[PDB]
């Protein structure tokens, strides 16, 4: 159901039951999976692939003629006027490379989102499943994002930053480069995260700091009234021992995994190492 | 005067002298009243009514498919790619449920807002009357906005935040759901307003502290020399009574109402009543 | 090469090699030089002229039909539904005065940025050669920015700032009315700046703090080992005078002049006349 007006090149891939509104544009070289849906003016360009029922809204642009591909999962929802796989603003990447974006499935992308393609053709910008990007948030080049993310209306994500599952970024979040986000993290609102942030944990505030544990994601994502007794009596060990072995934060985190009571939770274990991964090669320590 | 290029549906209801430009789209249920002026490239989808007089910038879309409506009253502005009355962020919005957006008169809304319809069909997202709503403002579902309001850049009001009139909101503001801001407020750049802000008063920096009353606004707004006064000498009683009655806010305010010579004054009367609700169930606080 | 659907009118100057997508509009004063293109669904209005090989990405809007001019160079990237030379938001703007905006050479400004015209006909709004302006950035009436300068993500210039050459913003800097950001400087993520930032200088977080010299800019910028040692030396000793000359800021900035050491280096008297200009009328002094 391609309105007269529309602009689809005879070699553009369209599948079954696609719905294409007036004043779209469809390139050469795109695939649209059966069932997708494009509002009036909107557009696909370069080498782009759109899973089965995807939509996009007016003025959404997804994919760009820069080599490399836009490759996007089922069931996503473009907001009206984001831009979705486009060039990366990193000046060192180089005219003419490759580059590239994946992104999984039932995601909704809002209005305004920038999403840009990797900064290098052996790197990729990759968004998993089921993450709930708000109005004006922008990704950077090399970002990865995992499943089930909330990030709220103009959270920016700088190049490589990591960010886990079932994380949340208030408003006007600005996550420095390179940072890490783990799983089940809060960010409050107009933080300035310059380090990771560790997994369960919340930071907020000016140039962020660390608050304690998401408790709140906790107790809503079925973790037991013990798992959370467990993590944050670990917490009061690392960060909280005002008294004992002074000058030395590795020392804790040792104590920490020979306490055989707490260690041997699953969750303590899984955080304990979320710490110690932001003190490998060329990680950002965490936030204070 | 319709160019032959846009898509204009025969029940579409066109108002007298209604200009629209190349490209456009206006679907079948969308009234537009006399005067109203479309530029190239704006939409206007759903159950939508637009008073005399309003006008469309390029890329400017209003309404969306969704049940219930986006009313819109005369003499508004909406900017460039400015998407006005479309579903709501709130994860807990049922599909199918009606949802509803109401904007009053003369309103200047810029390029790259974002103003979303109410998150159930009980409720309403509502704007006043001579709003200035700066670019990339984002408007979130269930939000009551009043008269008079000026929203600089990036000014984030979430879910069901409440602001009265003749209030400014510095760049990138960003409020909290379920905040208030009451009459000729007045919040610093950047501020994160995570409680209340009562009438006449001034918020600013990081997580938004309280710092006094809005004088240059209240001097701009015909506020009398003995009103302001006034004003000052009950602002010190409530918040600045640093020796007397310890760890008791409402016997301070207790203390103003019996005071005869401030109460009887109106903008006192006012504020504190202001003040008190913030108090009231379900209500935030106020700003520390 | 322009689409047969596109509107262009009979009067639109264009240059040799042009290429025009669909759904473009192009107005009848604008002119276009040899080489632009534009993408499908971009628009040009108003009296407008763009240099040798422009580039306008889908959706963006240069220019308007508000008496004045916008005027820019070649080799510029205009991205995907930016917004540039339209009327500012300036309340004192008045009806039907001429505004206008000057735009030189090889810039690249990013998707969904904002560039608005001069608030008064005296007055212009300027921007230099060879800036790159991320996404989502907001360049107010009456801005004046030189070469080079690089803008993250949601930075937001308001009205008559002033930037140099070679500055760099982080993301999500809010920069204050009449603020003047000088050569090489840095501003760190989230910082809302309400005073000057003097050449060579960095400033960081909440209401923006001094927090030395842009060392590390400098160090890219071909500064020598010497030149940055004598910045150094003259930055403690204008601003880490802890002990001597107390409740003065003036007269150590007599003893750095008098200081023929370091004040006969270009360096320091540029830094030195930098600070001085702050305090001259109008100006607001600089960050603490």
Same mark, same amino acid.
Request: charge should be negative.
């Given at each position: ?27 050469? !070289? #795109? ?9 009036? !003016? ?35 929802? +473009? ?26 499935? %039932? %995601? =909704? ?6 999403? &840009?393609?990797?900064?290098?053709? !052996?790197?990729? $910008? ?11 948030? &922008? ?5 990865? +994002?995992?499943?089930? %993310?909330?990030?709220? %209306? ?5 190049? &490589? #930053?990591?960010? =886990?599952?079932?994380?949340? $970024?208030?408003?006007?979040? #600005? ?15 107009? !933080? ?10 919340? #930071? ?33 060990? +690392?960060?909280?021992? $005002? ?9 804790? *985190? $040792? ?5 055989? =009571? *707490? ?26």
């Amino acid at each position: 159901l391609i309105h007269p007006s529309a602009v689809v090149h005879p070699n553009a891939v369209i599948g079954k039951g696609v719905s294409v509104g007036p004043y779209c544009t469809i390139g050469s !070289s #795109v695939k649209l999976g059966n069932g997708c849906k494009l509002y009036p !003016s909107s557009h696909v360009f370069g080498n782009t692939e759109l899973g089965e029922s995807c939509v996009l809204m007016t003025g959404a642009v997804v994919g760009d003629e820069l080599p490399g591909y836009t490759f996007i999962g089922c069931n996503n929802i +473009i907001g009206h006027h984001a831009v979705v796989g486009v060039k990366c603003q990193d000046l060192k990447y180089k005219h003419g490379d490759e580059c590239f974006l994946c992104i999984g499935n %039932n %995601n =909704e992308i809002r209005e305004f989102c920038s999403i &840009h393609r990797s900064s290098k053709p !052996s790197d990729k $910008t990759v968004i998993g499943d089921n993450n709930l990007i708000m109005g004006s948030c &922008h990704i950077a080049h090399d970002c990865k +994002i995992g499943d089930r %993310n909330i990030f709220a %209306n103009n959270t920016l994500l700088a190049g &490589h #930053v990591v960010v =886990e599952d079932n994380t949340h $970024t208030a408003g006007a979040s #600005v996550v420095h480069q390179f940072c890490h986000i783990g799983s089940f993290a809060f960010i409050g609102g107009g !933080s300035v995260v310059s380090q990771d942030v560790p997994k369960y944990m919340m #930071v907020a505030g000016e140039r962020a700091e660390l608050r304690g544990l998401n408790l709140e994601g906790l107790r809503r994502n079925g973790f037991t009234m013990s798992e959370m007794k467990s993590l944050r009596a670990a917490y009061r060990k +690392i960060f909280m021992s $005002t008294e004992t072995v002074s000058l030395s934060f590795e020392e804790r *985190l $040792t104590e920490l995994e020979q306490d055989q =009571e *707490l260690y041997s939770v699953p969750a303590v274990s899984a955080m304990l190492q979320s710490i110690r991964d932001s003190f490998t090669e060329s990680r950002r320590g965490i936030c204070k």
